[PDB]
Amino acid sequence: GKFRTILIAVNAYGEVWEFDLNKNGHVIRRWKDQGGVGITKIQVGGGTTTTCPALQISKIKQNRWLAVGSESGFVNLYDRNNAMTSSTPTPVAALDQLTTTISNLQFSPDGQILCMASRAVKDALRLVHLPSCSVFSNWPTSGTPLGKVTSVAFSPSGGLLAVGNEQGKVRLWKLNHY
């Protein structure tokens, strides 16, 4: 029955603050992302979070994967266990298959799949296997009616991935391993 919320905020330049919220807002820890000049989005995944919100305080876990998606198209993937304990960390991997501006970082509830998606051009989404930190290479091909993706949503249990593009349509895919 005891936990704590840690806000993790990110100024564009590449400086990441980490406040807690139980006690009124103090700066628990501050560090500099390696590189990442134009930084636009941040997400965490693997435990529980606002994308896989748990059910009861017994179901709350501690999160493992940190993603910093930055404007030129880059993603730096971070392992919490040693990023926090080094306090000037090193990226665990860099994903730059994408080429345009980064808009959506999300994870599957497990934290096994990192879904990244840009927003400046059609066909701009890819999924990444973790902890390999390797982009998948049989999806999505040139016959995937994606369109300009703007919102990335997994579902908690069923295993669906719903992706929503600009032309006004979401689309479903179901993953089988789930």
Partner: protein, 42 residues
């Protein structure tokens, strides 16, 4: 000629003579193989 009637050496030969599928299936090991998705559009 033939007559069929401490570690051996023919274990591999025999087991590959038996099995018909090597990229395992029965598992569903609650883990996701790299570089290949099992995805169905809906």
């Amino acid at each position: 000629d033939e007559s069929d009637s401490n570690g051996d050496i023919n274990a591999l030969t025999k087991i590959l003579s038996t099995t018909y599928n090597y990229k395992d299936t029965l598992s569903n090991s609650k883990l996701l193989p790299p570089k290949k998705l099992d995805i169905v559009r809906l």
